[PDB]
Amino acid sequence: QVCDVFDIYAICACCKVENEVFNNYTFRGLGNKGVLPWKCNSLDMKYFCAVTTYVNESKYEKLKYKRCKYLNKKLQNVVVMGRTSWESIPKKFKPLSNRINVILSRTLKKEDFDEDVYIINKVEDLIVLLGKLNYYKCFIIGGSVVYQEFLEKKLIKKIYFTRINSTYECDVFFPEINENEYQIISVSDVYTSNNTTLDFIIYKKTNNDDEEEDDFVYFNFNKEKEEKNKNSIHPNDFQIYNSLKYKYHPEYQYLNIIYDIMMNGNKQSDRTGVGVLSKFGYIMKFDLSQYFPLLTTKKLFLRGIIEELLWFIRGETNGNTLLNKNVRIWEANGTREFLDNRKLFHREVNDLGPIYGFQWRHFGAEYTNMYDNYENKGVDQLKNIINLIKNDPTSRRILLCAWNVKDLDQMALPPCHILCQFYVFDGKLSCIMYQRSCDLGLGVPFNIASYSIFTHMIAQVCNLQPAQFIHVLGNAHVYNNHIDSLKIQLNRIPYPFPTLKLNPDIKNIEDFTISDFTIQNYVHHEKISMDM
Amino acid sequence: MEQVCDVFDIYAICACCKVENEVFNNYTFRGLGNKGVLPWKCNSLDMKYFCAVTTYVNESKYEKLKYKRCKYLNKEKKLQNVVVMGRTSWESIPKKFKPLSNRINVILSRTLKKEDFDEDVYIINKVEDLIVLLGKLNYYKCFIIGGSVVYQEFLEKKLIKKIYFTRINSTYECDVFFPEINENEYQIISVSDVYTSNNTTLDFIIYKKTDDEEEDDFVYFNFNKEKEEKNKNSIHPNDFQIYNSLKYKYHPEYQYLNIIYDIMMNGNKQSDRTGVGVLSKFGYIMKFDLSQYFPLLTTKKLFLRGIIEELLWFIRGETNGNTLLNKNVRIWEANGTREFLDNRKLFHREVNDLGPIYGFQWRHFGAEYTNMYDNYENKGVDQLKNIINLIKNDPTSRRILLCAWNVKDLDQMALPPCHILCQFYVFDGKLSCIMYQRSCDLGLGVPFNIASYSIFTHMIAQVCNLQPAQFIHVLGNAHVYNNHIDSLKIQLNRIPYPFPTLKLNPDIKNIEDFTISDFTIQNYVHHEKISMDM
């Protein structure tokens, strides 16, 4: 077809516009009062400039040869804009350098601008110009109107589409791309620039020395499988996951582990007597300077997990404090029956024992009951790591450990979050967290969010910028009742990550309150129970 | 000129064992045959490599090679490789494997001609003759399969594009030897993973003779990034000439070596406790298949007596620096002096009383430490016994942890533990271990930490009646000390040898019952010793 031969791509950027339901169409703001709805965007004008200028000469022959057969017979690219589009560009910037500049304008002639700048009066009269020009690729660089007419006439091979994860005022939008006409094959890394997260996605038209290649196969002569889905999961079902080419979005660090356990997981009956797929040892790294890694492939609520962190920081072991705020994370572990079954016959219901908060603020003190004044009993690790970050940032001993071996049996249950280690470099703070037991379907999503918030909390009260939250999983498992749920999750394409704003006046780890925590521009898919 | 072996894609393949303070080089692996058969009887995994390499053909490349070969000579069923062997090698093949299946068998001989043979084989009497056969035949690649005379003369005439060479890491009686490869003529480019088969480790090395739509998407998506001056430390490429010149780096030792590279190139300049200076990064993961090898580094000489005496000393719950100095083991010496203890505020600590460190915490976690002479019978928690009981009776527990990081006791220790915690995992009668190291000296310490917990995984595996599987090493704050660098540069340009094996006296069935002579390291092949500051 036309768009395949003359390599007509489209490239854009769309912000959001004034429960919430989100979809691919949420990102559709192009222009306001002539200019872009956002101010500029250093990273986008970088991506745009590098896409529309990049050419591979030593790969043209294939395109001139093939573009000729169709018709019957310094290298550059084409940029097709509208007048309104062409006008809004400042003059300092025109024509767009190292680019063959075309302009759709009924009411303009070639005599009114320089020589190597083309004007065209209608759409089909570009096939003309491409047929008779020397170019690499033809980028449709916009107009609402220029995108609309060019897309609905199937003239577009791919759409290089930027997702600006922030709302602006808008007067012109992108057209509702049809998910049965185009599908996403590529999702880039998420980035901050000019005070917003953005990522880069690629839509493609649906179809309705080479010596050490062999060395590769020899060294692969021992691999275990030859299509027996290792476990009976059926790759077939997640066509969309398997159909993506580049999965650079950080959320795939999570999804790829779900994939890996499903596909290669060891079938096991666990302590619940219930059924898991388990592997051992994974790392995840999230860039807390670029984004806040709250999963987008399903809805996540963070009030509960924030109140639970504030409760840890206060040193509380009192289950009832959380139940009074309807945070029910710990409810099942405070009942007569659960504590009895832990042989804790002498323990008040909702007295969870010397768990996180107590170890954090009192490690080595003799646990009595959940109402004791423990003030100045045992070691305040939390106080200790905050002062080490501040006075000995280069210390390799900044750990916060909740696995007190003496106290485990006293605990409602031994912790899953064994320890945090901190690392300071150039006013930047990173945190490793080791988790001994990882429920990939229900737990780990929340766990990523908690320890990311904590990272910001520590960093802010130490006047450091947050850098990496690093997540080491020990026993990484998927309960069997989650599999049909997680397969739905794998086929959803992640949205750009929100940001977290902390109230910046808070400088004691002890002085935070729920209202000091704001998630910003959280775009998500609909809620799934991992559970029906 | 355009060489005969490139046109006709002539390769060699072989397997070499070692032969009856030694110095070690690639000429260690040189043993081909004995009394006419292989010195080892059958190595099945190597068998399977040999079959895989000598029968794989890729149809789509044939069209390019045929053209190339016609170009060279002036011309215009099912693709098979050619195999070429000495007459002695032909007779050493089992009758029922002759001729080699889905291969065109070419035999070299003078005593014998086509009439002396029943099988679908070509006889030639002359190396000349092979080039003529090859220019006549339709075939993918041509493989020289020995024996020694044949390897000798083909290599002699640089008729080999690459050698696919198998290092059998064991010693057998041998009458015939591979030629000493000239390193000007052939350099290594690739080295495989390491494996066990028929009671020996082996690896696979390769000597070399000295829709592009979704293709730009890749370049767009890498738009943003660091340059070659925002590759933080431009320490010189040239220094790692050998390491960068390798294409495939699948030998597990490269997990350790690649972390060194990454830290040397991306590392953060920091100061430290000693005041020395480090390149640092934060959070790495190494996995070692202890069922396929014992991951004792080969790029430098390592001795394991000290760290074995240290491990046993741990399991006994000892905190006594003298127990170790009396076995002439100096691992914990410096940490035990008057000056070091006084500087730790341990002014009431006897010299070489290292306090409630690993031993004490594995057997007595939560007990009040007194001195290194105290019987702590049934005080604190015996973690070691506890994790042994859990692996035996509750293998699916996600709570099989050993933890040395008693926060209570840190300041009372000579120094706080580097090795924070061990977690165990049981599937299918096999035992994996994760160890989290909070601070890691990539130069001096990690080499030994890898050995220490690998040995410990075997000890626990064995006394719980399970087989080893993976030791998994998580590095937290991972650092090269400045004055280790030059030494690490030399190491990185060394190619690993196949890992040794670890043998445990199997009679031992209680954790507390092992002694130094229950540990053998068989087949340690290694590069010359290095001092990490010079």
Ligand SMILES: NC(=O)C1=CN([C@@H]2O[C@H](COP(=O)(O)OP(=O)(O)OC[C@H]3O[C@@H](n4cnc5c(N)ncnc54)[C@H](OP(=O)(O)O)[C@@H]3O)[C@@H](O)[C@H]2O)C=CC1
């Ligand atoms: N987000 C992004 O990536 C981009 C956003 N923008 C923003 O887009 C907005 C401008 O878009 P919108 O107003 O449509 O502007 P357009 O660029 O679509 O301009 C439309 C004009 O182009 C001409 N035109 C359209 N179709 C044809 C045709 N088939 N043949 C000949 N001429 C044709 C006419 O010009 P004439 O009047 O001369 O006949 C028409 O009125 C601005 O806010 C701009 O900043 C621009 C580029 C990229």
Ligand SMILES: NC(=O)C1=CN([C@@H]2O[C@H](COP(=O)(O)OP(=O)(O)OC[C@H]3O[C@@H](n4cnc5c(N)ncnc54)[C@H](OP(=O)(O)O)[C@@H]3O)[C@@H](O)[C@H]2O)C=CC1
């Ligand atoms: N470890 C490994 O990878 C391998 C080991 N081996 C082992 O090596 C031993 C056998 O090899 P080794 O004794 O060298 O013997 P070879 O297999 O190399 O025997 C050489 C014989 O082949 C013929 N020959 C060789 N070159 C020529 C030539 N240029 N022109 C004509 N004939 C030629 C001659 O046969 P004739 O005398 O009959 O004229 C010669 O005596 C056995 O132990 C075997 O199992 C073999 C292959 C691989």
Ligand SMILES: O=c1ccn([C@H]2C[C@H](O)[C@@H](COP(=O)(O)O)O2)c(=O)[nH]1
């Ligand atoms: O924050 C938490 C708490 C629990 N778990 C999971 C791990 C296991 O699935 C289960 C805890 O039970 P054990 O691992 O202790 O058996 O819940 C998490 O993933 N994260």
Ligand SMILES: O=c1ccn([C@H]2C[C@H](O)[C@@H](COP(=O)(O)O)O2)c(=O)[nH]1
């Ligand atoms: O088993 C060990 C013990 C120590 N070290 C190194 C790490 C540091 O270089 C130093 C200890 O210093 P701190 O981490 O305690 O600051 O010893 C190791 O690499 N491995």
Ligand SMILES: NC(=O)Nc1cccc(C(F)(F)F)c1
């Ligand atoms: N070629 C032959 O006759 N014997 C043989 C047996 C085993 C392995 C190999 C090797 F090529 F991998 F080394 C060769």
